[PDB]
């Protein structure tokens, strides 16, 4: 029997929105440490890895590991039926055929509760190595969201370049080309590079516009680049975990 209570259920609502359009079905690795998801998209150009730690939940009790196969469209529909101030509670039992969700509005009169069928999945899990990165930018998520959306009208691939003065996003297409340069500043909506060596990777813009649907989870996004390694787009989830998107360069 697994039962986790999270007062700020909006987090769980926001998480499904970030994922549902990129990956359709995924396995939810429940454990005594917390929740973990990892999956590739169907092209396997990108990978998303989710971490919710048991310390973040207001109440957590997991007696044995479960690997719940979820349809993320189906789960998103159920989370839609939850107000953004609802205290969400998850609950399953070890012979897992259904996952139970319980929404309570914090005025105490309304109590929804749903029940979602699982499915059979086999995760092609992957090994994510520990490594320092050549360049790590930490900028506002709003702006990074607009950079990627805007440049996608010029061309379908971004060139992101990085030096200790500022970072610059560029792209090209049939109609022309354009660049965007942002510098470091002088906390919340600021830009700070922790740079070690210059980098000039490019990434397909299609995917980062899926990634940036995670913007409601944090004011800040952090980028991580080295040559010939996958880029890491990181949205922290406050005092609880993170959501990491991995994007393979082209070369």
């Amino acid at each position: 029997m697994f039962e986790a209570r999270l007062v700020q259920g909006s987090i769980l609502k926001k998480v499904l929105e970030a994922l549902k359009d990129l990956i359709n079905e995924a396995c939810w690795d429940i454990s005594s440490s917390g929740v973990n998801l990892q999956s590739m998209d169907s092209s396997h150009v990108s990978l998303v890895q989710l971490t919710l730690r048991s310390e973040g939940f207001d109440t957590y009790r997991c007696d044995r590991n479960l690997a719940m196969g979820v349809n993320l469209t189906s789960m998103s529909k159920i989370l839609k039926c939850a107000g953004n101030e609802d205290i969400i509670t998850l609950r399953a039992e070890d012979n897992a055929d259904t996952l139970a969700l319980v929404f309570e509005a914090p005025n105490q009169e309304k109590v929804s509760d749903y029940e979602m069928k699982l499915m059979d999945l086999d995760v092609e899990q992957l090994g994510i190595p520990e490594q320092e990165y050549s360049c790590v930018v930490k900028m506002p998520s709003g702006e990074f969201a607009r950079i990627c959306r805007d440049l996608s009208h010029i061309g379908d691939a971004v060139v992101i370049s990085c030096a200790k003065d500022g970072v610059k996003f560029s792209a090209s297409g049939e109609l022309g080309n354009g660049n965007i340069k942002l510098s470091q500043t002088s906390e919340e909506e600021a830009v700070t590079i922790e740079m070690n060596e210059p980098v000039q990777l490019t990434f397909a813009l299609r995917y980062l516009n899926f990634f940036t649907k995670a913007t409601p989870l944090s004011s800040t996004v952090t980028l991580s680049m080295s040559a010939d390694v996958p880029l890491v787009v990181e949205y922290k989830i406050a005092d609880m975990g993170h959501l990491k998107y991995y994007l393979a360069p082209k070369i």
Binding site: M40, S43, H44, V45, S46, L47, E124, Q125, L126, G127, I128, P129, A204, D228, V229, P230, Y246, L247, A248, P249, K250, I251
Partner: peptide
């Protein structure tokens, strides 16, 4: 051409 995520991370 895009390169893939399975060319950098390996099956565990």
């Amino acid at each position: 051409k895009d390169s893939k995520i399975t060319d950098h991370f390996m099956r565990l």
